[PDB]
Amino acid sequence: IVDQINRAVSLFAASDAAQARLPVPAFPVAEPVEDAGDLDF
Amino acid sequence: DHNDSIRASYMTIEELHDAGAALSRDGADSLPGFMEFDFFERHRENEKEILRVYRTTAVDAENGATITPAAEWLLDNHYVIEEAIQEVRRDFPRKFYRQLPTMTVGGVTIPRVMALGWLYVAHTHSTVSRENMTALVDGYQTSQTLQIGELWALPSIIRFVLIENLRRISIRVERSRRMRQKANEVVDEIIRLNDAEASAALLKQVDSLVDDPTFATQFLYRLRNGSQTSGFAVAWLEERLHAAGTDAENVMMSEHNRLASGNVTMGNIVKSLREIDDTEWSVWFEEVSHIDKVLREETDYEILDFGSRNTYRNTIELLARRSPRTEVEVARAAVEMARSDLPAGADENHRVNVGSVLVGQRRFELEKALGYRPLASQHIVRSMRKFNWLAIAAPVLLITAVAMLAVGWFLAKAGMPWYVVTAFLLMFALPASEGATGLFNTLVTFFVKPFRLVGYEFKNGIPEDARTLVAVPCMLTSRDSVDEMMRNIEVHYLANPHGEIYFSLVSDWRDAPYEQSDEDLEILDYAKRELAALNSRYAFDGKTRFYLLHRRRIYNSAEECWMGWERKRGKLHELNMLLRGDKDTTFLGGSNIVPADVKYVMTLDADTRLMRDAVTKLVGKMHHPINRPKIDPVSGRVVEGYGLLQPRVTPSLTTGKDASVFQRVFSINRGIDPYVFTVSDVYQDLTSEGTFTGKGLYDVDAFEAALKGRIEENSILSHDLLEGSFARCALVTDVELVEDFPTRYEVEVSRQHRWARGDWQLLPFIIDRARGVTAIGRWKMVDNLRRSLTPIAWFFASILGWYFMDPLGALIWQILLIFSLFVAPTLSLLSGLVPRSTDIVPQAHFFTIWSEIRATNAQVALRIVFIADAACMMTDAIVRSLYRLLVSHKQGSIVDYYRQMWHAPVVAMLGLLFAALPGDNAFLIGIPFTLLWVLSPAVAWYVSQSAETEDRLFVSEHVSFELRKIARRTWRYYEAFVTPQENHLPPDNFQETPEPIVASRTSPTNIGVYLLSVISARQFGWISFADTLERIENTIQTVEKMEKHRGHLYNWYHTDTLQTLGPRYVSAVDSGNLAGHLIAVSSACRDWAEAPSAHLQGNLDGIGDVAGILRETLKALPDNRKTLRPLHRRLEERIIGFSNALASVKREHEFASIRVINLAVLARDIQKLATNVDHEVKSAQSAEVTRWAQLLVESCEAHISDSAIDLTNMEPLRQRLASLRDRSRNLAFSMDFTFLYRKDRRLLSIGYRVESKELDEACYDLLASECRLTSLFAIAKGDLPTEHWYRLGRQVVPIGAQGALVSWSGSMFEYLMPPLVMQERQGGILNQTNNLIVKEQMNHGRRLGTPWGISEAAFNARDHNMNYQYTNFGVPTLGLKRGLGQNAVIAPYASILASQYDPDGALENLDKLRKLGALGQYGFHDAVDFTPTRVPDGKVCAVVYNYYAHHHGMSIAAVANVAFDGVLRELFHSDPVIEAAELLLQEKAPREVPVMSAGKEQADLLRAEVRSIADPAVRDREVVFLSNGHYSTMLTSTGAGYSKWNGQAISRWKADPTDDRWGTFIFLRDTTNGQWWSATAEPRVIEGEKTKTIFTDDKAEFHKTIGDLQSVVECIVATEHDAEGRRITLLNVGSEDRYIEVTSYMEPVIASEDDDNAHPLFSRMFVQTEIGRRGDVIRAWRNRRSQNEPGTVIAHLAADNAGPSRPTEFETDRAKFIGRGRSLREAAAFDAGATLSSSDGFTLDPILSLRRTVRVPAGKKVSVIFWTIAAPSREEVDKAIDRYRHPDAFAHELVHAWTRTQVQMRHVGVTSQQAAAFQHLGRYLTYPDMHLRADSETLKTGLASQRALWPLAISGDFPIFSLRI
Ligand SMILES: O=c1ccn([C@@H]2O[C@H](COP(=O)(O)OP(=O)(O)O[C@H]3O[C@H](CO)[C@@H](O)[C@H](O)[C@H]3O)[C@@H](O)[C@H]2O)c(=O)[nH]1
Ligand SMILES: O=c1ccn([C@@H]2O[C@H](COP(=O)(O)OP(=O)(O)O[C@H]3O[C@H](CO)[C@@H](O)[C@H](O)[C@H]3O)[C@@H](O)[C@H]2O)c(=O)[nH]1
């Protein structure tokens, strides 16, 4: 106890690195939608 | 159960007997272990292995590793093994190991004893025991008996075998541990790489280390039971173990043994070593050896003293060895020979006297009747004994003749007609003779065995038909020192109380020309009354043990006035006639009573102190028939026997307060050496006669006859030696009689003159063959004559040498004779350098040669500068001694010495002038000697002055003043915590910060230290006499009205109720300490009660100390008011005027009352001014000044009251003091330690238990503890024997250039508590060790940087019901206890206590402590802690706020001893029992003991674990828990987590391994740029963002730099409020103003987790949140549904700081926060608009949000403290919010949080590393990340869930931590 947990943590450590600096690609806003015909409501 | 040990099953009991019996006739065969080896080589290998794997164990086990249970036995008990490896190889030279026979077991030559001992450990459980081994010895001796010496060395060989087995086990366990760690490394490497080809390579590489059983135990378990497992390593390992017929179950059972067996064997070895060490062997040897069976019948050998029994055994062994005969038949023949010699004895009607043929005068007859071959050395000794005194003088004369021949041949080139050379050589060769005698003494000591006498062993005291009178010959010209004389008599009686012994004092007052002054009788009357009082104190069985005799001063001739018949010789003769009955003696009526028989008289002396049980040993030796004089009928000479005994006398170290450097010059060997028993005497080992100096016991009949029949008249001080000429004086050289050495040089000159006066009237006794004198006696007088004439001969030889020629070459001459003196003492040191012809290899025994080299140089210098004075004194002495009875005639200054001597300078100048005229070349050598000689009185006065001692120190006055004022400040504890509330006892503990409470527990040590502190304070002049007596009354009444167990105390007691807290456990040490303190207090009470006249004035010094205290405290007044400081300089002028007035008063020696009245007026005026300035300045510090002035004016009032005593009606006071003295002494002596004595291992039990009436298990075995003080009482009371003192402790450890006493947990109080009470001496080992301890403590403090003071204290750590705890501390260098360097706790009181040896350094350390906040209202605090693990923020050290009673008492005692030159050590020693037991002290420092063997100190201290994550984005996630006892929260490395309060949670959180986006979040948005990101690193994470995360205890830190900006987040949990806080701090770098906005996000969910996770919409709907007036706190709480929900109102606030007053921005609608189609990773709230329209109410998706725009300036920092609160109801959230709405408020709660986290940490046995490991376990226990779960194949056919309910496990909300034992 208190030695197995440390040993397991080091053995279970170490490609997902370039995905951190990309941040978020803002957001998308559309120009509404065309209200075509042929619809009851 | 095998390993590499020596195991031979187990024989239990009654099988050992017949086993050894079979071994006797049929042995050898085979042994469990055993092989051919060399004993010395094997022992060296064992020692090397122990050092190797002890250094290995030291360098390991501290870096962090598992330790087997068989390893810590070698670690913690290394002193036992390092002492056990000794003795062996020290008791076995190359001769003792060869003379014993051998059994040749197995073909190899094997001695019998260790062959037998081999099976003792083999056939048993490796545990030694007396009964089993005695049974084995008896069984072996059933057929063939053992021999003397063979039976002796059983423990040694047993220890050798035991340490060999220990080495085997140690190396085996080291190898097993190394294999285990290697297997762990290999399996970790295998599991790290998923490939399979490399696994085969690794297996084929490690195949060389698989056959060992201790490699697959961890390996196979790790493969089978792990996380990832394998399928290829097992396929190889199982096949390999199945091959070679080994399988796997055998391996899996192998580790079940060989480890528990190892632990059991190691523990058994340790216990066996302890049992061998502590248990005795003399009684075992007596009860086991078959030789003693023969000699325990028909003879008194069973009671003949242990040493004489040893001599008998040694003689028997020597006779049996050389002579071809067995020892049993030799003993039988000796017994028959003794029987055939007739009884011839009064008391010897029964038994048989056996010594007459063994050590008697029939040794030669037995050796010739048995066929013994004497040794060549024995032949030489016998021949030279037959050659009488001629053989004594032959080497001396031969060496002198060689010396004169050599000097004559060397000085054969001088000229002159050769008429002076012969006389010159004859008068010169005195120092050559002295050197020859010294060389002869050295040779005989090195070769000739010292002679020891034989005597009885009076275990029951002196029996009937043996009565001894101890008579001290002195005078009663003592108006006051008659009390000293009776005290000396009482001490002498207390030395040897048991037996039929009586004590008498004989007197003859001064020397007056008349007969009687007709007044001395009344002067005697007081004496005859005083002794009568002593009789009332000692009258047992109607027996009077005290007598007085007085002479009548009959006129004889002249000069000496009227001495009766003669001097003290005549007095002793008159006593001799009186004892046998003489009615007409020249004595006085009334005081002429003799106690009947008393056939034996002891003389002793005035200043000599009688050693414990000394004369009792002398009485037996005298009474033994061998040592009984027979009175030769032809002449009163006594051919054989001894009528005079003289024990050796060695000077004491010091003489109390009189200890000058002159003492440490003319006497080096000072004290008693327990190691040595017999000192080789040339005159006794070769001639069997000694010189009687007048201090010894003697008979009456033979002594009286031989003294009366030969002496006519003319006897002087030398007659004592003449007595040896008429008897046979034997030097015992076995019993010590200490004697003080005078310090003044004048006293030494007077004593030398007196000794030399008597040595020159014996010339008729030498030159005349008539009268009667021993043949060697003439040689004794010749030796005395030459020893007296040496200085005159030296002076004459030197002056004539530079008078005749002295051209050049005689210069070399003045170099040679001065070398001769150098020969005289240094040859003695030759006995200390020869290692007995390098028989063995010594250990680190040091050299210390410089000390005695410097001592010899100083002695030679003093001798050469006093040559002229000694020559003048001897010349005048011999002239007087011849002019009388040969011509028929019959303190101060340097000016005093000059006028007294007036001889050496004038004579030296005359000689120099007379010699320098002829030749005119003899001045170049004469001038230095003459100038050195004329200055002799100057160096004489310089050396006669007393130097600095253990009591008197050069402390100047400023240091003393500072110590006195510190003590006065400290005494506030006793002043304010002793009350007449039925307590009268100081509380043990006092808190002052954490709501201070007064403790209600008191210990006897506390009572004693309080009592002695009261005595010291009264001596200081701080309180009135009446107050002191009242306090003594209260303390004594409380003590007597207290529960006791056979006088003892139950340690802890209540104060208000005076009951026992817990079990009534008696403490042995505390009772002894209290008894010693009570003894000292009673002695002091008697001291001021015998004359209560001058003690009533007062010291008149304490008021000056408190005035100085006021002066110092006034400098701390912050006088910076609007009206300047007028009152300040008013007050200072008043105080300096008061100081001047008191200085003038104390300058006056008449002590005018009007002066002290005016002083009181000034004091009260100063108090009024202080009150005036205080009530105007509302400060918390001026109250201290005002109360100090008030206490000052009570002190002045008390001094006035003590100055107003009537001094007339003092009898009630005197009788009260007498009654208190008697009651205190009776209470102290009512102690009973006898029932606490363990008569199995000696020593003392730790305590007694009132439950089952059982003793404690442990004992005290160290001479470096306070128990020593108790031991003194244990000997003072007389309830313990003397060997108990010598059978414990006395261990030395190397450090520096010397060795120090080893102490368990080596703090300073172990070395300071004893000397605080009784008196030590400079020459003792105790004072030297204390000085060392101080020096090394300062060195350790310097190395650690922090000031020293490591002692008993309270480490800065709390617990429930705050008490700061209490434990022991020490230094690892001198502690013998692992775990001392990890604390580094500094206690200021240790510096005060260690002030008796270095006041300046102690004061400097105290000032260094004063530079920090180590001072409080009640003087100094408890201690200060420097341990990083117990220090908050960036502070360097933390001061523990405790006050202790015993610490303050120790400080007061130490300062009183320093200021008053150890007054306590004197008053404690003012009891006769203390002087009786003091000779057990004194001892002798050794400098030759077998010393043992041993920036790292800075790193040795415990350091807290700082878990820091470099980049919490690409590494594995890290989590941390925070708790408040009722409120818990989760913080992840990315900033996620939750918040739980009493089961139910607050913030929603789900365990998503891939998302991890739940919790309270902080967002930072730029205004101009429009960019936004997060304070943590998860949702946004813009480019750059150099971030880091710190998870330490209590607080959590998230730091992030984005370039030009640094943002830090501090997450904390509140104390006693159930709140959480987040400090966001933004600091700029560039010089540009920037706009930023903060946002807080958290979703409130008040539910028990499952309820929200089941149907979230209910939890969303049942939330009512709103914003109140002055909007910055948003509150929320569930709407009331039923009558059973709590409600748990929560709230969130921003608490803006470092900014203007601006409105907040809130939004409680997540629909308008997210954007209906987005996530937290991209929210619509950070767009260009829709900025928190502030909608509140019953929102379907309630959240808590707070926005504030903050303008961070250029260069500085801005912080905002977000807070969240949860409370059971709404009526109490207001006080929590207002508690945090106050500015700052981040401190105060922070330190409280740290303290409570420490409380929680220490409430369980958890370490910081253990806490980190537990959090790492929790990260897997909570998150469904399973990196340590079961195997994939194992988990693929199990986990049916419903089956877990059979074990009564809920398995609903349970991570289920499994563990397999
Ligand atoms: O303070 C002291 C103590 C002792 N002596 C001795 O007194 C003697 C000097 O006296 P001196 O001038 O010789 O005359 P007396 O007094 O006749 O001589 C005696 O002086 C002492 C008797 O009182 C003893 O020492 C001796 O019996 C003897 O010398 C010397 O022996 C000194 O040691 C002093 O002078 N001063
Ligand atoms: O200032 C002086 C003068 C003399 N003496 C002593 O007095 C004696 C001198 O007398 P002296 O005529 O030289 O006779 P001595 O042959 O020395 O014999 C003396 O011895 C006794 C012991 O002091 C003296 O008292 C007697 O006068 C005398 O018999 C010597 O002992 C000197 O030590 C002093 O101590 N101090």
Short mmCIF file of N, CA and C in Angstrom, two decimals, chain B residues 342-413:
data_model
loop_
_atom_site.label_atom_id
_atom_site.label_comp_id
_atom_site.label_asym_id
_atom_site.label_seq_id
_atom_site.Cartn_x
_atom_site.Cartn_y
_atom_site.Cartn_z
N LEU B 342 44.68 -29.23 62.13
CA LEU B 342 44.04 -28.90 63.41
C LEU B 342 43.12 -27.70 63.27
N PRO B 343 42.01 -27.65 64.02
CA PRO B 343 41.13 -26.48 63.96
C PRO B 343 41.84 -25.20 64.36
N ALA B 344 42.37 -25.17 65.58
CA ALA B 344 43.15 -24.06 66.10
C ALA B 344 42.43 -22.72 65.90
N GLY B 345 41.19 -22.67 66.38
CA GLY B 345 40.40 -21.47 66.24
C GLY B 345 39.21 -21.41 67.18
N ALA B 346 38.94 -20.22 67.73
CA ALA B 346 37.80 -20.05 68.62
C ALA B 346 36.49 -20.11 67.83
N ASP B 347 36.32 -19.20 66.87
CA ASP B 347 35.15 -19.24 66.01
C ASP B 347 35.17 -20.41 65.05
N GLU B 348 36.35 -20.96 64.75
CA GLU B 348 36.47 -22.07 63.82
C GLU B 348 36.39 -23.41 64.55
N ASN B 349 35.34 -23.57 65.35
CA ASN B 349 35.04 -24.87 65.93
C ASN B 349 34.39 -25.80 64.91
N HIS B 350 33.60 -25.24 64.00
CA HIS B 350 33.01 -25.95 62.88
C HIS B 350 33.72 -25.53 61.60
N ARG B 351 33.32 -26.17 60.49
CA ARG B 351 33.90 -25.92 59.17
C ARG B 351 35.40 -26.19 59.17
N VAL B 352 36.07 -25.87 58.06
CA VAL B 352 37.51 -26.08 57.93
C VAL B 352 38.11 -24.86 57.24
N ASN B 353 39.22 -24.36 57.78
CA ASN B 353 39.95 -23.26 57.17
C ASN B 353 40.79 -23.80 56.02
N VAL B 354 40.44 -23.42 54.80
CA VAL B 354 41.11 -23.96 53.61
C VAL B 354 42.15 -23.00 53.03
N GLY B 355 42.13 -21.73 53.42
CA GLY B 355 43.06 -20.77 52.84
C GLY B 355 44.49 -20.93 53.31
N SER B 356 44.70 -21.58 54.46
CA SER B 356 46.04 -21.75 54.99
C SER B 356 46.92 -22.59 54.08
N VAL B 357 46.32 -23.44 53.24
CA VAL B 357 47.09 -24.25 52.31
C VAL B 357 47.01 -23.74 50.87
N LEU B 358 46.01 -22.92 50.55
CA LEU B 358 45.88 -22.35 49.21
C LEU B 358 46.63 -21.02 49.10
N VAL B 359 46.28 -20.06 49.95
CA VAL B 359 46.92 -18.76 49.97
C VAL B 359 47.64 -18.47 51.27
N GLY B 360 47.65 -19.42 52.21
CA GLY B 360 48.29 -19.23 53.49
C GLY B 360 49.80 -19.38 53.42
N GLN B 361 50.38 -19.90 54.50
CA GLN B 361 51.82 -20.09 54.60
C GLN B 361 52.24 -21.53 54.33
N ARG B 362 51.33 -22.35 53.81
CA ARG B 362 51.63 -23.75 53.50
C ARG B 362 51.42 -24.04 52.02
N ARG B 363 51.51 -23.01 51.18
CA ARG B 363 51.39 -23.21 49.74
C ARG B 363 52.52 -24.09 49.21
N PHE B 364 53.75 -23.85 49.68
CA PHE B 364 54.89 -24.63 49.22
C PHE B 364 54.75 -26.09 49.63
N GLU B 365 54.24 -26.34 50.84
CA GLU B 365 54.06 -27.72 51.29
C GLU B 365 53.06 -28.46 50.40
N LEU B 366 51.95 -27.80 50.05
CA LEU B 366 50.98 -28.43 49.16
C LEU B 366 51.57 -28.64 47.77
N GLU B 367 52.31 -27.66 47.25
CA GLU B 367 52.86 -27.80 45.91
C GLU B 367 53.93 -28.88 45.85
N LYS B 368 54.63 -29.13 46.95
CA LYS B 368 55.61 -30.21 46.98
C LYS B 368 54.98 -31.56 47.29
N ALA B 369 53.83 -31.58 47.95
CA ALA B 369 53.12 -32.83 48.19
C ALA B 369 52.23 -33.24 47.02
N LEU B 370 51.95 -32.34 46.09
CA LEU B 370 51.12 -32.66 44.94
C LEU B 370 51.92 -32.86 43.65
N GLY B 371 53.16 -32.38 43.60
CA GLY B 371 53.96 -32.51 42.39
C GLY B 371 53.71 -31.39 41.40
N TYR B 372 53.85 -30.15 41.86
CA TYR B 372 53.62 -28.97 41.04
C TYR B 372 54.94 -28.41 40.54
N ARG B 373 54.95 -27.97 39.29
CA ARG B 373 56.13 -27.35 38.71
C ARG B 373 55.95 -25.84 38.70
N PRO B 374 56.67 -25.10 39.54
CA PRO B 374 56.50 -23.65 39.56
C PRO B 374 56.99 -23.00 38.28
N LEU B 375 56.34 -21.89 37.92
CA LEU B 375 56.75 -21.12 36.76
C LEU B 375 58.07 -20.41 37.04
N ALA B 376 58.80 -20.10 35.96
CA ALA B 376 60.07 -19.40 36.11
C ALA B 376 59.86 -18.03 36.76
N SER B 377 58.79 -17.33 36.39
CA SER B 377 58.47 -16.07 37.04
C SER B 377 58.19 -16.28 38.52
N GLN B 378 57.48 -17.36 38.86
CA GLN B 378 57.23 -17.68 40.26
C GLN B 378 58.54 -17.96 41.00
N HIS B 379 59.45 -18.69 40.35
CA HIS B 379 60.76 -18.95 40.96
C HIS B 379 61.51 -17.65 41.21
N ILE B 380 61.50 -16.74 40.24
CA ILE B 380 62.19 -15.46 40.41
C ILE B 380 61.57 -14.66 41.54
N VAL B 381 60.24 -14.63 41.61
CA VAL B 381 59.55 -13.88 42.65
C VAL B 381 59.89 -14.44 44.02
N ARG B 382 59.86 -15.77 44.16
CA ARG B 382 60.18 -16.39 45.43
C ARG B 382 61.63 -16.13 45.82
N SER B 383 62.55 -16.21 44.86
CA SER B 383 63.96 -15.97 45.16
C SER B 383 64.19 -14.54 45.62
N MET B 384 63.57 -13.57 44.94
CA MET B 384 63.79 -12.18 45.32
C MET B 384 63.09 -11.85 46.63
N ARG B 385 61.97 -12.52 46.93
CA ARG B 385 61.36 -12.39 48.25
C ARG B 385 62.29 -12.93 49.33
N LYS B 386 62.93 -14.07 49.07
CA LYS B 386 63.91 -14.61 50.00
C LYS B 386 65.13 -13.71 50.13
N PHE B 387 65.43 -12.92 49.10
CA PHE B 387 66.53 -11.96 49.15
C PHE B 387 66.14 -10.64 49.81
N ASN B 388 65.04 -10.64 50.57
CA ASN B 388 64.54 -9.50 51.34
C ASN B 388 64.66 -8.16 50.61
N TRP B 389 65.05 -7.11 51.33
CA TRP B 389 65.12 -5.77 50.77
C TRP B 389 66.33 -5.56 49.87
N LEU B 390 67.29 -6.48 49.87
CA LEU B 390 68.45 -6.34 48.99
C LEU B 390 68.03 -6.36 47.53
N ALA B 391 67.11 -7.25 47.17
CA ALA B 391 66.62 -7.32 45.80
C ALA B 391 65.82 -6.08 45.42
N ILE B 392 65.25 -5.37 46.40
CA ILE B 392 64.54 -4.13 46.09
C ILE B 392 65.52 -3.04 45.69
N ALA B 393 66.62 -2.91 46.42
CA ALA B 393 67.59 -1.85 46.18
C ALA B 393 68.61 -2.19 45.11
N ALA B 394 68.74 -3.46 44.72
CA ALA B 394 69.74 -3.83 43.73
C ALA B 394 69.53 -3.15 42.38
N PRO B 395 68.34 -3.19 41.76
CA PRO B 395 68.19 -2.48 40.48
C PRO B 395 68.40 -0.98 40.60
N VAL B 396 67.97 -0.39 41.72
CA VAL B 396 68.13 1.05 41.90
C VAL B 396 69.61 1.41 41.96
N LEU B 397 70.38 0.67 42.76
CA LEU B 397 71.81 0.96 42.88
C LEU B 397 72.53 0.70 41.56
N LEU B 398 72.15 -0.36 40.84
CA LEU B 398 72.78 -0.63 39.55
C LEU B 398 72.51 0.49 38.56
N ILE B 399 71.26 0.95 38.48
CA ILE B 399 70.93 2.02 37.53
C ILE B 399 71.63 3.31 37.92
N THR B 400 71.69 3.62 39.22
CA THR B 400 72.40 4.82 39.64
C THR B 400 73.88 4.74 39.31
N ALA B 401 74.49 3.57 39.52
CA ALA B 401 75.90 3.41 39.19
C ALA B 401 76.14 3.60 37.70
N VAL B 402 75.26 3.04 36.87
CA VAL B 402 75.36 3.28 35.43
C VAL B 402 75.24 4.77 35.13
N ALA B 403 74.33 5.46 35.83
CA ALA B 403 74.13 6.89 35.59
C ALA B 403 75.39 7.69 35.93
N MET B 404 75.97 7.44 37.11
CA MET B 404 77.18 8.19 37.47
C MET B 404 78.34 7.84 36.55
N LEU B 405 78.49 6.57 36.16
CA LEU B 405 79.57 6.22 35.24
C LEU B 405 79.40 6.94 33.91
N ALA B 406 78.17 6.97 33.38
CA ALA B 406 77.93 7.61 32.09
C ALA B 406 78.19 9.11 32.17
N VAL B 407 77.69 9.77 33.22
CA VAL B 407 77.88 11.22 33.32
C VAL B 407 79.34 11.56 33.57
N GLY B 408 80.05 10.72 34.33
CA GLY B 408 81.47 10.97 34.55
C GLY B 408 82.30 10.81 33.30
N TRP B 409 82.01 9.78 32.50
CA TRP B 409 82.73 9.61 31.25
C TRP B 409 82.39 10.72 30.26
N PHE B 410 81.12 11.15 30.23
CA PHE B 410 80.74 12.24 29.35
C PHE B 410 81.34 13.56 29.82
N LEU B 411 81.40 13.78 31.13
CA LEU B 411 81.99 14.98 31.70
C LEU B 411 83.45 14.78 32.08
N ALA B 412 84.15 13.90 31.37
CA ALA B 412 85.55 13.63 31.63
C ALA B 412 86.49 14.65 31.01
N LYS B 413 85.96 15.60 30.24
CA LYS B 413 86.75 16.67 29.63
C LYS B 413 86.34 17.97 30.29
#
